[PDB]
Design a protein around this ligand. Structure first.
Ligand SMILES: Nc1ncnc2c1ncn2[C@@H]1O[C@H](COP(=O)(O)OP(=O)(O)O)[C@@H](O)[C@H]1O
Ligand SMILES: [Mg+2]
Lengths: 183, 52
């Protein structure tokens, strides 16, 4: 079967089946509970709008990103985001598809372990693999050497690679990124 | 004196001949490559690098 190449990121979740050119569904990763009271009855008001739906009703929501700086600070919301990504934006049950998450360098271990535990227990995938976000960006350029500066929205990290041999002692991770520029 | 000069020159010439025989023998090992260029103005491949 085909593999699911998900990419959590921080600010935009990008996902799609392996072997294409562009991600199938790209949508902000925000989960916003309503904050006002609500008087219309039977309007079908949900308790949390996630993804791109909460960028249209954002006038009466309190959007809150579940990923602060690479690390994940609110596991329930992240689980909700993943569930939405699998079932509504791709409509493929995870029981029949390998997954390939991505993770920033130098992140806490507990984050990665919890990620794999969720993927194996809740969604019950057949097999998942976690890859460093810079090696992939080096794949896409068709190179095999080079030093890649991957300035995302959560964290900016700079992984040098030569001839396929990564240099673990030369990774410089800096926490200034797009969110701090927005602020 | 002439005999001594003749024997010394004979030995020297024999040694020089022994050397020079192989000196001329395998002197074509100098054949190597020059690695010229052609500007490769006809490469139109696709992005499918999976072998790396
Ligand atoms: N065209 C653009 N010009 C300037 N900044 C942009 C543009 N597109 C996205 N950004 C910034 O980059 C962020 C998205 O980065 P992204 O690569 O999606 O992060 P991640 O690594 O989490 O996927 C946005 O928050 C935005 O601030
Ligand atoms: Mg990124």
């Amino acid at each position: 079967t085909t593999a699911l190449v998900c990419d959590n990121g921080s600010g935009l979740v990008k996902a799609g089946f392996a072997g294409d050119d562009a991600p199938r569904a790209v949508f902000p990763s925000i989960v916003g509970r309503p904050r006002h009271q609500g008087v219309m009855v039977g309007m079908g008001q949900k308790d949390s709008y996630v993804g791109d739906e909460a960028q249209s009703k954002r006038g009466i929501l309190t959007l809150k990103y579940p990923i602060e700086h690479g690390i994940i600070t609110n596991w329930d919301d992240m689980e909700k985001i993943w569930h939405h990504t699998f079932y509504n934006e791709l409509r493929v049950a995870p029981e029949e598809h390998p997954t390939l998450l991505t993770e920033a360098p130098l992140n806490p271990k507990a984050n990665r372990e919890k990620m794999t535990q969720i993927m194996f227990e809740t969604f019950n995938v057949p097999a998942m693999y976690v890859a460093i976000q810079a090696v992939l960006s080096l794949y896409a350029s068709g190179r095999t050497t080079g030093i890649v500066l991957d300035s995302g929205d959560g964290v900016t990290h700079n992984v040098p690679i030569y001839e396929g041999y990564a240099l673990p002692h030369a990774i410089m991770r800096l926490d200034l990124a797009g969110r701090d520029l927005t602020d | 004196l002439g005999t001594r000069a003749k024997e010394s020159l004979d030995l020297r010439a024999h040694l020089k001949q022994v050397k020079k025989e192989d000196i001329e023998k395998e002197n074509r090992e100098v054949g190597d490559w020059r690695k010229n260029i052609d500007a490769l103005s006809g490469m139109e491949g696709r992005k499918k690098k999976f072998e790396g």
